[PDB]
Design a protein around this ligand. Structure first.
Ligand SMILES: N[C@@H](CCCNC(=O)CP(=O)(O)O)C(=O)O
Ligand SMILES: N[C@@H](CCCNC(=O)CP(=O)(O)O)C(=O)O
Ligand SMILES: N[C@@H](CCCNC(=O)CP(=O)(O)O)C(=O)O
Ligand code: NI
Lengths: 339, 338, 339
């Protein structure tokens, strides 16, 4: 048996709080130079169907820091998607690595990969959600809480396009009982199916959500978050197309930051298009935390990797008697046996 | 001095038996959570001219588990083939890594890579053979013996005369088993292939047959197949391979039943479901191709360890020089500043 | 605070001697089977915008041998250059790896990477220079000194095109007080800006330099070095064009080696186009050291990685009290808490 991390929908608020604490404890060790070897000799498979800096580097660095190794599987290097099915790739890699992640074009690909694998599977971003981004962002919001405010009393406003990141931020904030607002133009807002999911989260947590094109909605924001305008990796919008849709109403500039509040923090998942969704002045300003946010991609990924491997080991414990016997048997073989 | 693993033609049956035993001992250790650090701080170079999942991941996971590291060198990343010859690449990498593997478009590349390198070299598949697949398949058959001995078993390969087909021929006839290639005219193992299988058998007491007779599958303990689309660089179309192989060479439940109730299904993977094999067979109770994929890792761990142990035995470290060098570096780092 | 390795122009002769010595001491340890774990659990980011065998393999192997890991970031794998600016990539990776190297198309990219990063940055080759090649060639010339001669006693002649390797070799030889010659045809010689820098090196070092199309300039050389004729990776000179420029006058054949002197050594950064800049007979001959030179790409890279990380740790030391406290708190958490 095993557990996956495909969506935060299968995790309670309490479970996410455990993941934040675990991640932050590991972070404090490493920043002071103790590298806990919690994943010693473990191997991670890393399937990427799209380009990536933060997610990919975070997984490779995490494995090394914890005593294991991440294997990068680019497009064209593996047979998946043409000569081999998703179910076969899954069953095979279950025999070859200890834990698996994938960034996929279509959400169904990660669902199938997780369902057919006998080892833990992590979603590195699909067209539907970005759950490792969720934990990273939450870690970041915990570290940058406004003075005298609790997490659930905070207002988080996503500005612009209804990307997978926009939805994910909605899912995590509402899960933790916070107040979420998506400020976006008509035709590019979170849809009815998205909103019913936020509604289900809010009944349990006591949080709230709004989806609107009202410019005043930013007022009182403690966190202001944005993403790129050019859409999905495989079907980008042209510069001219996205400008007509979002510019200038949805550009996070200094006057918008001032409209939200003097203490409001700027967040972005990155990469950013400077001059489009955000100005140089904001992203490089004193209230930008999007570089601490990028650091926290690594923070959250270490905690998840450690939690899921701990979970797997508890469900599939090693036999220590058989372990010592096998060790002894290999050592005798190497001592006495020649080719 | 060194040893290579380019073809099992340079290995005796007894040597192949040792490699099996070593690989299985490592597997039982790791299965129970003991990772033997037998390749500590060693670097493997990995040249891939074609796509791979099982071979590539197996070498990377293998090195991590044993205390070392594998480096993936994909096409376009290195200058080999355009601005650099294979002999220079070989001489350069012999100075930069401890051990080398390559999956090549053409067999002469691995031959030349091995002969010019001063470090051990492994063939990760050519157009000619696939020797790490041979050891992995041998490990698999040992674990799934019918009660028969290995040398009493019949192994039928079904379909195209791929490099995997011939490699299975070589390993089975080397171990003294009974081999059949069941394939259509024009796509059978050729006269040069068969002469090598014949040389193996005269030594081992095994047997071989190349035929298009469907009754040849009867009594098979293992029934093995591969894809129909040929070489990576020049694939056969969907319409053309169907005309060549379908339905005669599709491994379906009728064929498995004709082989025998206890016949096991093997396939090197990736498989084209609905072509060389049906969903029913590959997902069925008698399919062992996923155990077989696991054993690509098993066999590769054993090979890396053997070849490095052999290398170390032939080029041993001077422990007096080792301690003197260690002391000198420590004195340097303690006392000297930029 | 940190230090970079972008150009040997920021390093004194005494500093370069230290680096050679460190690299040679590490080399002798590893050659005899002792792997010093000087970079335990550290991560190196490797940005490659061009193809590479020696530089890429040296970095990955170097990290494994010293206890760390190198991460390969190829073209198309990261969004830098299209959807992300050089400055943002630098600040982000500063949070995700410990040390960074890049092979860049344009020299301004490595300068910007280094200037914006809070971690050490190594130049893995640009269109301007190639400083890890410089240190490798220095280690190589030290190991192959003529009897009774010092490095500063030696005459080094570079043959052919004014490549970045040509200029770099000029920089490192003049820095160390040696006698450097560029033997190249008019229009393809080191320009006035290059020569002015060599002249300034010579004022301090006691060395000398000459740029000439005179064939007799090879006479009395202790090392004879060459490179390809096809120019830059992005803008290659065709076979017919380059042959018309250089062939046969600038081909390193046995006649040129004999003209240089019986004991003269042949050097080449590689890869070599046999039949163009050099013949089979010379590169495969008894006086060829280019494969030893290739080995010393790894020799020099190990020394550089260690020095820069030691420098960083000295400037940014870990606090051992906070380290132990962080270790204990993590250990307590894993013992007592569950999801
Ligand atoms: N809406 C964006 C989301 C990017 C999220 N960014 C990350 O995960 C950081 P990375 O891509 O460098 O890993 C898109 O669809 O591209
Ligand atoms: N005849 C096939 C052989 C593939 C063997 N499969 C493997 O080695 C598994 P891999 O490709 O995932 O490493 C071909 O030439 O393509
Ligand atoms: N003038 C040459 C310099 C190549 C240097 N070679 C190396 O650094 C060895 P590598 O490319 O294998 O890393 C060019 O611009 O191509
Ligand atoms: Ni690696």
């Amino acid at each position: 048996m095993k557990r996956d991390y495909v969506t935060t929908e299968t995790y309670t608020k309490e479970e996410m709080h455990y993941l934040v604490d675990l991640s932050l404890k590991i972070k404090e060790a490493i920043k002071n130079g103790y590298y806990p070897q919690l994943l010693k000799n473990k191997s991670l498979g890393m399937i990427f169907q799209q380009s990536s800096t933060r997610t990919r580097v975070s997984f490779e660095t995490a494995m090394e820091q914890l005593g294991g190794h991440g294997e990068y599987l680019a497009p064209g290097q593996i047979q998946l998607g043409g000569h081999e099915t998703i179910e076969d790739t899954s069953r095979v890699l279950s025999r070859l690595v200890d834990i698996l992640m994938a960034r996929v074009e279509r959400h169904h690909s990660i669902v199938d990969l997780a369902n057919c694998a006998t080892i833990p599977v992590i979603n590195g971003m699909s067209d539907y959600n970005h759950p490792t981004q969720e934990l990273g962002d939450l870690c970041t919001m915990v570290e940058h809480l406004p003075e005298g405010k609790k997490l659930e009393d905070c207002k988080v406003v996503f500005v612009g396009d209804a990307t997978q990141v926009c939805f994910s931020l909605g899912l995590i904030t509402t899960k933790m009982g916070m107040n979420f607002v998506h400020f976006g133009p008509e035709g590019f807002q979170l849809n009815e199916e998205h909103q019913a999911k936020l509604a289900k989260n809010c009944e349990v947590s006591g949080g709230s959500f709004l989806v609107t094109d009202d410019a005043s909605s930013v007022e009182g924001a403690d966190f202001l978050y944005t993403d790129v305008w050019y859409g999905l990796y495989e079907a980008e919008l042209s510069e001219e197309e996205r400008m007509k849709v979002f510019y200038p109403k949805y550009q996070v500039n200094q006057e918008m930051m001032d409209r939200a509040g003097a203490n409001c923090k700027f967040m972005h998942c990155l990469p950013a298009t400077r001059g489009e969704e955000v100005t140089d002045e904001v992203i490089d300003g004193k209230n930008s935390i999007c570089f601490d946010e990028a650091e926290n991609r690594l923070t959250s990924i270490r905690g998840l990797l450690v939690y899921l491997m701990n979970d797997y080991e508890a469900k599939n414990p090693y036999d220590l008697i058989k372990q010592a016997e096998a060790k002894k048997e290999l050592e005798v073989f190497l001592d006495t046996q020649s080719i």
